[PDB]
Structure 1
Amino acid sequence: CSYTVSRPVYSELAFQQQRERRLPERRTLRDSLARSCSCSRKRAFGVVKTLLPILDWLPKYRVKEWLLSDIISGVSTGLVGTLQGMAYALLAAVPVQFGLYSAFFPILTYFVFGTSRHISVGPFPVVSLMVGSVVLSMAPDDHFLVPSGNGSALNSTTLDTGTRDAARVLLASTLTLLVGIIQLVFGGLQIGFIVRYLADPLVGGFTTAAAFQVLVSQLKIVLNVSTKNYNGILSIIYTLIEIFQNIGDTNIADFIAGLLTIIVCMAVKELNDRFKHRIPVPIPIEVIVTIIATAISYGANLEKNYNAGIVKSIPSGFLPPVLPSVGLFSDMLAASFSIAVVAYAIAVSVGKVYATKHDYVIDGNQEFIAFGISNVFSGFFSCFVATTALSRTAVQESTGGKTQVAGLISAVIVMVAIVALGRLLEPLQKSVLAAVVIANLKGMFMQVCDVPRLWKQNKTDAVIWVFTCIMSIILGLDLGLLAGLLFALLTVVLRVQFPSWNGLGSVPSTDIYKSITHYKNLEEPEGVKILRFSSPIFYGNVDGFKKCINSTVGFDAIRVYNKRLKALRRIQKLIKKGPKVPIHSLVLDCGAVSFLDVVGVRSLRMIVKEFQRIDVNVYFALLQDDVLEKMEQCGFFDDNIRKDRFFLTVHDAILHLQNQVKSRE
């Protein structure tokens, strides 16, 4: 209808007199810590239900059809997960059966502490790549070349296949234990705001660069070339150059097989993704391609006749738990922190996606605790860091997944594999397992197509994507994340250091104030100049505010007073012998401020004092209550700078100025 008001001009004190405030809540530290710690059985039951969410979804089961859905999803996800684990085991520089280990214990551990229903905990290409990189950095190949074998001229320093795998597995287990400890520390301390800094473009660029490096590593594995595990600055460029220089030492059979299975898997995946209306259940192309590869590789002796590369080192059994080799935390702390934070970010992303898909709640700290306990339990059985693969997670979602029982059934497949299924997988070529990893990289490789879309959107967020992707390629992958978080924080600081100030004016016959750089037909008060300044004043944008004021008033408050003094000395000597014209007042519409940064309130008081010498009043329009209460403690309201200078709304200041001009000429 109509918007009409009728009230006197309450600037700061005409509203503060008759209005009674609320007394602040008493701290009472003793009572605060006492009331925080509860003793009733209700809080205990609540924290027990929250810490172990397994007792929640179990009593309300729907076994009738849920059992069949869970068993089919379990067998499907078990096949997919054992394949992905035996594939990713190469990325961690560990034997292939440790991938089956890491596909068994984390699933069991994420059953009594998890809080999700559509998450398949297991390996991940990015995490496996980071683990392999830090293992190669902390345990290179040229550190175990034992001289033996009666060489031609010098000592026969051949490869140390064998005992070196034990050292690599011990290093990976120590890394996993440290990652789990870091996750449990982050969870128990209730600190969850530390992972909010990994923005969507940042994690997107990080996953893109990690997928590119995974493609490089898998191409190195498929081509069957011997590199020098270059790490550090430009590691990916160095290893790509080394691959391009070692093209002659390739294997035609392995390369042809890898290219063929890549083409087949990609074509079948695209066909299944496109024609979803006719086939709801995704065809397990991984399973059939692995079966046919094992069949072909076993019939014809590809190992002997074609000199192919097979595993032929599967022990096909369990092992007793081994205590982790404590003592290498100082040289892997940052790597473990990076691995933990990226794993938790990917886990939270997948959880939120598959939760908003099925409309259920997922707690962050509980997921952190669950993944921490999972990594800790994995460290005691020679496993690497566990996460949720988006490809494997989609399997249980498409085939039908209701509870974690489908995941528990998925562990039964890996269970029967570790003991029995895998002795027949002996003649399987390593290039076959190295191919499905590349085929699963389609999701992260298509993420590059959003950069043109982000450019039409906020450009600062698009630069962060490119900055993260490039920095996570030049200066390694683990250090690239730290270069991305700091760059994002710097971009946030820059957006508040250079605000968007305007020339706010008055709309005729109304009281709403709009910017002058956006609207044309606006009337500003005669002599009065209004200024709006977002991005609250801190120690960095103080000079920015000075420049903004000097630009919006046309002159400089310092130079005007300097010229006044230079003209005054001629006045004081002539009697012995014998700029600030248009501006009348300044209204600062500081309504978009949150903090004040007293280092900045000092400069604000300096500005107000300097404008007093040139007889130009500087008022305030829409300062908040929490801002004025903070400025009061900062020593700003002296005997000269009273509260009448501040106002409540922008139009009240203009009305007061007009009334003062009318009553005082």
Structure 2
Amino acid sequence: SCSYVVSRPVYSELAFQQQYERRVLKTLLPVLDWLPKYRIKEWLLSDIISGVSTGLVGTLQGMAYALLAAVPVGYGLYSAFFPILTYFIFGTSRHISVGPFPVVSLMVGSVVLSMAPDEHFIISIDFAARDAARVLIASTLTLLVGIIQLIFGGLQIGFIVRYLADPLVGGFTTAAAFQVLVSQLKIVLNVSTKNYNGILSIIYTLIEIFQNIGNTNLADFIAGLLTIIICMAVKELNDRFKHKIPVPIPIEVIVTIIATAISYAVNLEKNYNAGIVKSIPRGFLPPEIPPISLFSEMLTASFSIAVVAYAIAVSVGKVYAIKYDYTIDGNQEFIAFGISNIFSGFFSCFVATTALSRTAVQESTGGKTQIAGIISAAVVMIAIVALGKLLEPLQKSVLAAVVIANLKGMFMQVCDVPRLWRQNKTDAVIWVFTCIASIILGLDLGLLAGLMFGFLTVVVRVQFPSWNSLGSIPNTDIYRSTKDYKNIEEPEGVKILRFSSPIFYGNVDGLKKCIKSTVGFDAIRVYNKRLKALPIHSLVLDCGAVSFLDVVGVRSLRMIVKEFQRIDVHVYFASLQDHVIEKLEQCGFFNDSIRKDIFFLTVHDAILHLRSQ
């Protein structure tokens, strides 16, 4: 077959350089971008059906996730309504449904509970004033999140969600599922547990829940259990029996309607003391300017909430964009969601993002442009102004049960943890650390810890790389580690060291130790011994994988070269990239008799050059 034949001079870097010479309408993405391009002839019907279905789903989801946040039911309707309108303009995606997404809602509720506890606020009971304070804190956090998102959009730094690695995303998702389960289990049992704010909050909440389980409400617990069983069974049947009924069954909506009708018919509120929403405001409240003074106490939480909400939004947007063959602008997603969160925070809402289930409902029911979003917003509006009184007898345990039933996919990544461990130990470590940190910390603090742990794992992987003592495969130009192939011959009086990482301070110390181990000695000790009195003659450094190089690395390279030259040992560098050589030359490496003539193209010109002497 084909053979590897090449005839050329031995080029050093100096010789190679000598012979081969070197050397305005998108920030506000208009609705006019697609409204004139709209397809009125047929798209209206699909948009209307999809919007009605996803609005029916989104009213329920906003009401349910308003319990995850520490705000009364009814403001979830606002959080489902306002962000859709203020995303219809700036939004790039045309399939995602904008709403609470109970993970962001639970982080918001954790912030609100930390900044407005029951005992800290009410010292008399002042339900109305406490609810007003909780709503105001939620609106302030939403406005801060929107400001952060808009700032990130202005700076065009949309690559930050790259840092949200899949292992840490999965660990954070499982931990958030655990937190949501704990909160909604507190809700369904109708047990009054004092809210623990800080570290080990979830564990203390569980301890108090199982302590006060004796005070559980039978009606609320039974309703929640029955709702969970019905929803999960219907979802399982739909997953199995999937060839028919292409649209997913809106089991949650029907379950909530039946529960509300039954609770209105037999009046669980007064007969069994059931926990119902008991209050939904009618009409739209006037806007209020959030107090910016609280911004200092929400920074570490607003940053994490903005990052998580945007990551979920673009995740769902990209999942549906690769399906419908279009691209979503990430920086414009910053802009759209930041403006949306600011607008919603002014109008008394909590942080807005998209939900995978709601987006799936919207798309599977004839998903088309964001007009379906507008129809969903109109449905939420008519629920706000007309259907507010009808949903009063509905139990909060039903909404919590709906959320718990939806938590299954988020609970299932414990199954993929072991295969992650088998595939790559550091990824499983990232997963487990993110999960545990998000459990015994805040969810925001857990996210920040997971991000910095991912950064630390990258730093450790580049700091302790693979390094090999290379010898030649006979009659070829293939150099491989002498301990791996058993047919590798060691050349005459020269050691070849491949350091498979960029050289920086941690890699400085690692590379010094690796050279000392490879050559079997160190230059300083032998030089001092020879001075007091008064095996290897060359070391080739295979730097093919050296990506970058800093001033500490350049200093280390100069020190290594000088120390080995002191004991008549020549150090040659091979396979260095052009930019690394430029870094060397601008860092002052080529001074004091270096002259770039000890740099070869690969680790075979070095050996040939040695054999010439």
User: Normalising to structure 2: TM-score of the pair?
Assistant: 0.97
Hey, what does 1:597 align to over in structure 2?
Answer: 550
Task: Answer whether contact 1:49 1:55 (CA < 8 A) is retained.
Answer: no
Which residue of the other structure, out of 588, 593, 598, is the alignment partner of 1:635?
588
* Cα deviation 1:379-420 (Å, max 9, x = unaligned): 121101101011111111222202111111111111111111
Hey, what does 2:307 align to over in structure 1?
Answer: 341
Give the secondary structure class of the aligned counterpart of 1:95. coil
Compute the displacement of 1:648 (Å): 1.3
Hey, what does 1:73 align to over in structure 2?
Answer: 50
Q: Which has the higher helix share?
A: 2
5+ residue gaps, structure 1 = 23-46, 148-158, 570-580, 661-665
Compute the displacement of 1:356 (Å): 1.5
Hey, what does 2:86 align to over in structure 1?
Answer: 109
Hey, what does 2:360 align to over in structure 1?
Answer: 394
Give the secondary structure class of the aligned counterpart of 1:504. strand
Q: Does 1:58 align with 2:35?
A: yes
Give the secondary structure class of the aligned counterpart of 2:8. strand
- Which segment is superposed worse, 51-60 or 284-293? 51-60
- Which segment is superposed worse, 631-640 or 76-85? 631-640
Task: Answer whether contact 2:482 2:489 (CA < 8 A) is retained.
Answer: no
Q: Does 1:170 align with 2:171?
A: no
Task: Write the letter of the residue equivalent to 1:354.
Answer: Y
Matches within 5 A, 1:186-335: 186-335=152-301
Hey, what does 1:14 align to over in structure 2?
Answer: 15
* Cα deviation 1:111-167 (Å, max 9, x = unaligned): 1110001100111111111111111111111133353xxxxxxxxxxx221222111
Task: Answer whether contact 2:116 2:130 (CA < 8 A) is retained.
Answer: no
* Cα deviation 1:64-104 (Å, max 9, x = unaligned): 33222111111110110000011111121212111111111
5+ residue gaps, structure 2 = none
Task: Write the letter of the residue equivalent to 1:557.
Answer: A
* Cα deviation 1:444-472 (Å, max 9, x = unaligned): 11122211121122211110010000011
Task: Write the letter of the residue equivalent to 1:6.
Answer: S
- Which segment is superposed worse, 220-229 or 161-170? 161-170
Q: Does 1:646 align with 2:583?
A: no
Compute the displacement of 1:604 (Å): 1.4
Hey, what does 2:112 align to over in structure 1?
Answer: 135
Compute the displacement of 1:170 (Å): 1.2
Compute the displacement of 1:514 (Å): 2.7
Hey, what does 1:447 align to over in structure 2?
Answer: 413
Which residue of the other structure, out of 87, 94, 112, is the alignment partner of 2:64?
87
Distance of 1:109 and 1:138 partners within structure 2: 28
Q: Does 1:616 align with 2:569?
A: yes
Task: Write the letter of the residue equivalent to 2:471.
Answer: G
Distance of 1:316 and 1:258 partners within structure 2: 27
Task: Write the letter of the residue equivalent to 1:14.
Answer: A
Task: Write the letter of the residue equivalent to 2:344.
Answer: S
Distance of 2:345 and 2:540 partners within structure 1: 64
Task: Write the letter of the residue equivalent to 2:242.
Answer: K
Give the secondary structure class of the aligned counterpart of 1:13. helix
Distance of 1:617 and 1:200 partners within structure 2: 46
Distance of 1:367 and 1:129 partners within structure 2: 22
Matches within 5 A, 1:524-603: 524-566=490-532, 568-569=533-534, 581=535, 583-603=536-556
Decide whether aligned partners of structure 1 residues 82 and 505 sit closer, same or farther in structure 2, where only a CA change above 3 A counts: same
Compute the displacement of 1:50 (Å): 5.0
Compute the displacement of 1:555 (Å): 2.1
Distance of 1:316 and 1:261 partners within structure 2: 27
Give the secondary structure class of the aligned counterpart of 1:7. strand
Pairwise CA RMSD: 1.5
Task: Answer whether contact 2:122 2:130 (CA < 8 A) is retained.
Answer: no
Task: Answer whether contact 1:53 1:115 (CA < 8 A) is retained.
Answer: no
Compute the displacement of 1:271 (Å): 1.0
Q: Does 1:100 align with 2:77?
A: yes
- Which segment is superposed worse, 99-108 or 160-169? 160-169
* Cα deviation 1:159-212 (Å, max 9, x = unaligned): 221222111111111111111111111111222233322111112211211111
Decide whether aligned partners of structure 1 residues 517 and 413 sit closer, same or farther in structure 2, where only a CA change above 3 A counts: farther
Q: Does 1:437 align with 2:437?
A: no
Distance of 1:93 and 1:442 partners within structure 2: 23
Task: Answer whether contact 1:49 1:56 (CA < 8 A) is retained.
Answer: no
Hey, what does 1:31 align to over in structure 2?
Answer: none
* Cα deviation 1:6-27 (Å, max 9, x = unaligned): 21111122222233332xxxxx
Distance of 2:316 and 2:514 partners within structure 1: 45
Task: Answer whether contact 2:470 2:497 (CA < 8 A) is retained.
Answer: yes
Task: Write the letter of the residue equivalent to 1:648.
Answer: L
Give the secondary structure class of the aligned counterpart of 1:303. helix
Task: Answer whether contact 1:102 1:383 (CA < 8 A) is retained.
Answer: yes
Q: Does 1:3 align with 2:12?
A: no
- Which segment is superposed worse, 63-72 or 299-308? 63-72
Compute the displacement of 1:639 (Å): 4.2
Distance of 1:145 and 1:529 partners within structure 2: 76
Task: Write the letter of the residue equivalent to 2:289.
Answer: L
Give the secondary structure class of the aligned counterpart of 1:620. strand
Task: Write the letter of the residue equivalent to 2:558.
Answer: R
Task: Answer whether contact 2:174 2:414 (CA < 8 A) is retained.
Answer: yes
Hey, what does 1:181 align to over in structure 2?
Answer: 147
Task: Write the letter of the residue equivalent to 2:589.
Answer: F
Task: Answer whether contact 2:498 2:541 (CA < 8 A) is retained.
Answer: yes
Matches within 5 A, 1:453-532: 453-532=419-498
Compute the displacement of 1:351 (Å): 1.3
Q: Tell me the number of residue pairs that the alignment of Structure 1 and Structure 2 aligns.
A: 612
Q: Name which one, 1 or 2, has greater alpha-carbon Rg.
A: 1
Which residue of the other structure, out of 347, 362, 373, is the alignment partner of 2:328?
362
Task: Write the letter of the residue equivalent to 1:631.
Answer: L
Task: Write the letter of the residue equivalent to 2:455.
Answer: L
Decide whether aligned partners of structure 1 residues 146 and 11 sit closer, same or farther in structure 2, where only a CA change above 3 A counts: closer
Task: Write the letter of the residue equivalent to 1:19.
Answer: Y
Matches within 5 A, 1:17-36: 17-22=18-23
Give the secondary structure class of the aligned counterpart of 2:286. coil
Q: Does 1:119 align with 2:96?
A: yes
Distance of 1:454 and 1:288 partners within structure 2: 39
Distance of 1:399 and 1:621 partners within structure 2: 61
Task: Answer whether contact 2:434 2:449 (CA < 8 A) is retained.
Answer: yes
Hey, what does 1:663 align to over in structure 2?
Answer: none
Compute the displacement of 1:55 (Å): 2.2
Compute the displacement of 1:53 (Å): 4.2
Compute the displacement of 1:564 (Å): 2.5
Distance of 1:298 and 1:432 partners within structure 2: 14
* Cα deviation 1:477-536 (Å, max 9, x = unaligned): 121111111111111110111110012221222113233343221223222221111211
- Which segment is superposed worse, 354-363 or 218-227? 354-363
